[PDB]
């Protein structure tokens, strides 16, 4: 999922401990818009990154997949006053 | 910072360093002063503090309030320490010391924030304090006449000024006269333990009395006590430290007999030992018997048969006070009960005071002790009355030591501020700002008086400044008239040592707080 995070910036890969929230641990929560969408756990039963990519893409869950600029360009977005030429 | 695989100090050690640490110390001192500001002046208010056990302490004394607080800030505890020091050395001014110290720190905080070296501030405080103490000693009013009536009036005025901020301020004349009368009967050391203070619930404040003698509560009478007479018109008192009851002759003593005749002889011998002690007491001519050790019921009945008064388990302090008042001597042996070891009082009487029985030893002409019997409607009421009387007693004793007085109401501190400002206006200029800050800080007390009274502080401050500048030394705050007045002519008098020690302690606390640049707190051990 660390590798997939580079491919899909729009996703919010994260982790959580089981204790901070006994059968819970011994025996992948997908959220979109605040509601559960994907409900797959113990995905090791069903490994490298592109296998997980295909596993999630086969069910229409992962969004469809850009040039690397110098560093960035953005400065601001406000009343620019535009580049008025004359008069 | 980095993990540093081996750490220098214990994990959890907290360190603060630099100007922020010092300004945080100043803010903590400000908080401590704020905790006691409104208890200053004739319009001051009491504070109610409840501990974990649920007991409530109500006080107008700065030292008591500060002690009852669980101050844990290392810098803030210095204010409590200097308040306790002022209480120990003088007994009054426990609020003034904290207010002055915190106001000093508040005044020098702006100069601290701009990177001024703390040693300069310390030197300025030392110079200003020395000059202020010298000025106080110079301008303090003393009368070198040794006049009894004038000295008595000075004592009464000082006591009234010391008492006119507590809940007994309405009867302050009465209590001041009582305190002055009590103090002058102490012989040479003015020991506080020679002035007993008894608190009895029920009764008005004006019902409290000063016994020219000794009085203490009845102490666990045995059977046959009610058959004794309870009033003698010229009794001789046998002060004793003796356990008068049938008991083993000694703890390790053992009796070994092999005859019934010896058994009866032993029983008769024990009875005869007790009766011989009692007969030796009786033949001395004494009519009132007081013992530190218990007096048995057999001894009580024996004394009742002879029309004599007995009282066992009397507290040691009360026996010492009785001995000092009457003139006898505490005896551990009854073999030599001569007339020189028996006290004498004009009248002894057992009376009832609000649901408690008290023994009175009045009429002693050469008594060196007293006994306040404080009446009040509540426990904390009597406790606060005792605290106020303690303040007055300490002031009167210090006045006995030296009769040097200054006018209160901020007049002395206004004069000191004017003098310090005038001095600071004639120095190169780096110390000028700091000495001026000290002089301005000396104005907190009249401002606090006006604020507690509910006045407009700024107008009174301006009027006092104008009057002191144009001539006039003892012009302070007149609470009743909402104006200023010549407090010396208003008999608002304070011993000079009170203000001297207040300024000294406040300056020392301010210098100590300023001198610290870093605080380190090691982790607590055995947290459990």
């Amino acid at each position: 999922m660390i590798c997939l995070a580079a491919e899909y910036p729009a996703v919010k890969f994260c982790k959580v401990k089981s204790s901070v929230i006994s059968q819970f641990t011994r025996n992948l929560l997908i959220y979109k818009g605040g509601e559960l969408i994907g409900n797959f756990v113990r995905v090791t039963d069903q490994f490298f990154a592109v296998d997980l990519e295909a596993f999630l893409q086969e069910f229409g869950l992962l969004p469809e997949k850009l040039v690397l600029t110098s560093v960035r360009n953005s400065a601001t977005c406000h009343s620019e006053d535009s580049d008025l030429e004359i008069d | 910072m980095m993990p540093t695989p081996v750490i220098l100090l214990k994990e959890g050690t907290d360190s603060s360093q630099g100007i922020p640490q010092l300004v945080s110390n100043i803010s903590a001192c400000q908080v401590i002063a704020e905790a006691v500001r409104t208890t200053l002046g004739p319009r001051g208010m009491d504070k109610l503090i409840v501990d974990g056990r649920g007991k409530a302490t109500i006080s107008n004394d700065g030292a008591t309030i500060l002690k009852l607080l669980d101050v844990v800030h290392p810098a803030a505890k210095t204010l409590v320490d200097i308040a306790k020091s002022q209480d120990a050395e003088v007994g009054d001014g426990t609020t003034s010391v904290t207010l002055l110290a915190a106001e000093f720190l508040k005044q020098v905080k702006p100069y601290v924030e701009e990177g001024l070296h703390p040693q300069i501030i310390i030197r300025a405080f030392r110079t200003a304090t020395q000059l202020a103490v010298n000025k106080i000693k110079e301008i303090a009013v003393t009368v070198k006449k040794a006049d009894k009536v004038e000295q008595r009036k000075l004592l009464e005025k000082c006591a009234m000024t010391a008492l006119s901020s507590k809940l007994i301020s309405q009867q302050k004349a009465f209590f001041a006269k009582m305190v002055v009368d009590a103090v002058m009967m102490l012989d040479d050391l003015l020991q506080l333990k020679m002035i007993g203070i008894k608190k009895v619930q029920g009764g008005a404040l004006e019902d409290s009395q000063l016994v020219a003698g000794v009085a203490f509560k009845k102490t666990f009478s045995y059977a046959g006590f009610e058959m004794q007479p309870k009033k003698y018109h010229n009794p001789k008192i046998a002060l004793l430290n003796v356990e008068l009851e049938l008991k083993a002759e000694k703890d390790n003593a053992e009796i070994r007999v092999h005859t019934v005749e010896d058994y009866q002889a032993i029983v008769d011998a024990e009875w005869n030992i007790l009766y011989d002690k009692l007969e030796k007491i009786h033949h001395s001519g004494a009519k009132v018997v007081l013992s530190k050790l218990p007096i048995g019921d057999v001894a009580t009945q024996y004394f009742a048969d002879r029309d004599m008064f007995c009282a066992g388990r009397v507290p040691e302090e009360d026996l010492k006070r009785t001995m000092m008042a009457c003139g006898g001597s505490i005896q551990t042996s009854v073999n030599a009960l001569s007339a020189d070891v028996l006290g004498r009082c004009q009248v002894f009487e057992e009376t009832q005071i609000g649901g408690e029985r008290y023994n009175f030893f009045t009429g002693c002409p050469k008594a060196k002790t007293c006994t306040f019997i404080l009446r009040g409607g509540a426990e904390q009421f009597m406790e606060e009355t005792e605290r106020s009387l303690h303040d007055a007693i300490m002031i009167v004793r210090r006045a006995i030591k030296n009769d040097s007085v200054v006018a209160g109401g901020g007049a002395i501190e206004m004069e000191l501020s004017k003098y310090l400002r005038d001095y600071s206006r004639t120095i190169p200029g780096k110390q000028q700002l700091l000495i001026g800050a000290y002089a301005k800080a000396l104005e907190i007390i009249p401002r606090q008086l006006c604020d507690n009274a509910g006045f407009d502080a700024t107008n009174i401050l301006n009027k006092l400044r104008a009057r002191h500048a144009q001539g006039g030394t003892w012009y302070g705050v007149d609470i009743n008239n909402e104006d200023i007045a010549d407090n010396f002519e208003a008999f608002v008098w304070e011993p000079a040592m009170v203000r001297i020690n207040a300024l000294t302690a406040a300056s020392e606390a301010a210098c100590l707080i300023v001198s610290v640049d870093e605080t380190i707190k090691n982790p607590r051990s055995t947290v459990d």
């Binding site: - | 100090l9 001198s515 090691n522």
Partner: protein, 98 residues
């Protein structure tokens, strides 16, 4: 020098600028700092003053020793030079008595 407010594990409050007292109240854990503290306490016991001098000089010596080790010297050579310089300083010191 500025006084330091030090709170030990028993909540006792010490305010002072005496180096030996500060070291005693501080809960030093690093063994090398412990050794420096022992040297300071030995100075305090033997003479009664100069503990802060001991700390400052030891720290400066160790900093410059680290510099010397970084510039390519060996530990033994630094130790030998320090001992020679200490002997020279002990020789020179009596000549400075005013």
């Amino acid at each position: 020098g500025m006084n330091k407010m030090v709170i030990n594990h028993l909540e006792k409050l010490f305010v002072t600028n005496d180096a030996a007292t500060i070291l005693r109240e501080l809960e030093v854990q690093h063994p090398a700092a412990k050794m420096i503290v022992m040297a300071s306490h030995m100075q305090e016991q033997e003479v009664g003053d100069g503990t802060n001098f001991v700390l400052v000089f030891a720290g400066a010596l160790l900093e410059l020793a680290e510099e010397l080790l970084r510039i390519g010297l060996s530990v033994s050579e630094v130790i030998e030079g320090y001992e020679i310089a200490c002997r020279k300083a002990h020789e020179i010191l009596p000549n400075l008595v005013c």
